[PDB]
């Protein structure tokens, strides 16, 4: 028997929406440790011989995120249901509801890890976004608010 | 005592956030009912027993009214 704030999970995002989430999210990959290194060696080669803009990539530490929700930096939040201590995230869907930040429980904790160069992630969030995908994001958000927030208004109740 | 403990906006929020997220423990689950039927008089009695001192229970029963009153109306 499950208390309502637990298994506010398991009522995750659907198939078509989920893929489209990653359709967006895989666009915002953090640079890999290999890539970052070569980039800088490319700089060193150049800057030893003879401008850049701030780079959008998704945000991924639980800390960093819980910072970001509640500070309004966050736009969309992705929260994996299966986590070793569930308690490590149980507050998180409510916090977001309270700061009005759009959130979706995604299925597959490893599946978050994909989009972020790590083994797992528990939580990732897309804070800032490119100009072209700005509309793509805000629509996804709405899609999520329909099929997840409005569909499961009774997720805060029922055991 | 100069750094006593001014409320802080963040911490206040968290306390209440957790207060609502967790729900209510069995003695408190009994306690809110003991307010709604038998009155604040009999409510404090069990609270004083269930915790240590009266001062603890008093501040506890006062937190109970804050929950019940803010829940039904707002």
């Amino acid at each position: 028997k499950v208390p309502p704030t637990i298994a506010q999970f398991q009522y995750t995002l659907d198939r078509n929406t989920a893929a489209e989430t990653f359709k967006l999210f895989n666009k915002y990959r953090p640079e890999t440790a290999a890539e970052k290194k070569e980039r800088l060696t490319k700089e060193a080669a150049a800057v030893a011989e003879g401008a850049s803009p701030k780079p959008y990539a998704v945000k991924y530490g639980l800390n960093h995120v819980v910072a970001l929700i509640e500070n309004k930096k966050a736009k969309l939040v992705l929260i994996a249901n299966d986590v070793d201590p569930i308690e490590l995230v149980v507050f998180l869907p409510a916090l977001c509801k309270k700061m009005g930040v759009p959130y979706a429980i995604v299925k597959g904790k490893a599946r978050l890890g994909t989009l972020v160069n790590q083994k797992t992630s528990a939580v990732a969030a897309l804070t800032e976004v490119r100009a072209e995908d700005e509309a793509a994001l805000a629509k996804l958000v709405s899609t999520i608010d329909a099929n997840f927030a409005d569909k499961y208004d009774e997720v805060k109740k029922h055991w | 005592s100069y750094k006593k403990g001014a409320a802080s906006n963040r911490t206040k929020f968290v306390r209440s956030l957790v207060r609502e997220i967790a729900g209510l423990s069995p003695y408190e689950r009994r306690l809110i009912d003991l307010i709604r039927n038998s009155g604040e008089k009999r409510a404090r009695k069990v609270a004083k027993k269930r915790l240590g001192s009266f001062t603890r229970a008093k501040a506890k029963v006062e937190e109970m009214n804050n929950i019940i009153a803010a829940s039904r109306r707002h």
Binding site: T5, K157 | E20, G23
Partner: peptide, 15 residues
Amino acid sequence: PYEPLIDWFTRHEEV
């Protein structure tokens, strides 16, 4: 034993 979690605090969004 199994009351619905009445969200007495998240009802009102923070500005």
